Design a protein around this ligand. Structure first.
Ligand SMILES: [Cl-]
Ligand SMILES: [Cl-]
Lengths: 233, 233
């Protein structure tokens, strides 16, 4: 059974990947966001949805989890979804400005503001992607993100969270925080995933070298055939 | 039916992708090599092979096609193959030195020399990946690559070529050149693919924005579900 990583373990594994293993961020971020779009398309196939193209709002935060979201949005569009992005706080780095341009060239619209009421979100988007905070955030949720999470917590439509539900303690979870219907753990699940309450938990990010898996005792499941996700039941 | 691109068209589309669209090379190279490993695993599944782990020799050339090969090798290992790489001429750029390190950390061995006889290649490797020359090469095949192609042309085991069979005119093919059993066209097929004589032609590189597909009249086939390849019949 797969290892659930502490924040310190997650950070160690990441340090190795981008340093000794010499993977680049945009490379693993590409594979991670592809896994996210893949898990979404598996859990909520366009046929299962009442809108042809199904609508999705992807909300991207100010760090790497936000980047995973941008890559996720672009693959969802290729997979037959109709994504909209809300990306209020963007790092001033070419990685992210390039990702945004890519989404714009995919004809994915960016919102200028978040709808202020859950009912409006419910009415416009069949699914909401939470790409707000990742496993490095240790907190004080400041604004614009506190009120965004407040709206998310009132939604009727499902939320899919990338890696960790935003606003959860990376190890401890958060009983009173958002409760995503889908979680995509990237690389290996974090300890907070033991508190996951939704229907779908997928592992994604099929790039972990066997040597790293062995060193950290990750005990990854076997991804089937050529798939980049695995459904954890 | 899909458009088969001229060299000039292929180069235009590439210029757009990496310039106006602001995709990065390592990003599309990741997706391209993943599609290659995926097509290989579909056409030659490990179960269909007489060796548990199936052995594969991936021969990487001095440009981007060589890079696609390196990414291909690493995903093949994750897919359950036992790759070996021969990479005689390597650009002095971090893109490629990083890819090599990644393959080394995947425990993929690099050969110091090419076996000089087809029989030896046949005996050691169940499949040979031709990642030697891509659609930018306009020629004189110099050495070490001329004698490598001479050995390849004598093989009994199948060759899978990335994008274009190395040594073929990118538009005209080459009746007397290598005859791969699998071709993975990347982005859109090139005119040389009309001369393809093998059993398996896959399209890969599922990243083409609809606007670019429209502008160049690519008429891409519909990739099924979340797959990153499509079998062209
Ligand atoms: Cl604040
Ligand atoms: Cl020479």
């Amino acid at each position: 059974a797969v290892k659930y990583l502490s924040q310190e373990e997650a950070q160690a594994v990441d340090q190795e990947l981008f340093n000794e293993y010499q993977f680049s961020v945009d490379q693993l971020m590409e594979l991670a966001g592809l896994s996210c779009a893949t898990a979404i398309a598996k859990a909520y196939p366009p046929t299962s949805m009442s809108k042809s193209p199904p609508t999705v709002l992807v909300i991207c935060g100010p760090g790497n989890n936000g980047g995973d979201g941008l890559v996720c949005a672009r693959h969802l569009k290729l997979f037959g979804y109709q994504p909209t992005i809300y990306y209020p706080k963007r790092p001033n780095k070419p990685l992210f400005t390039g990702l945004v341009t890519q989404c714009q060239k995919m004809d994915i619209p960016f919102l200028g503001e978040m709808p202020p009421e859950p009912m409006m979100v419910d009415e416009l988007y069949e699914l909401v992607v939470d790409a707000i905070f990742g496993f490095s955030f240790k907190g004080d949720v400041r604004e614009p993100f506190h009120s965004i999470l407040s709206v998310l917590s009132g939604l009727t439509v499902p939320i899919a969270s990338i890696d960790i539900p935003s606003g959860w303690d990376v190890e401890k979870g958060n009983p009173s925080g958002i409760q995503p219907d889908l979680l995509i753990s990237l690389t290996a699940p974090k300890k907070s995933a033991t508190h996951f309450t939704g229907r779908y938990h997928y592992l994604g990010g099929r790039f972990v070298p066997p040597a790293l898996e062995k060193k950290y005792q990750l005990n990854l499941p076997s991804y089937p055939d050529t798939e980049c996700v695995y459904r954890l039941q």
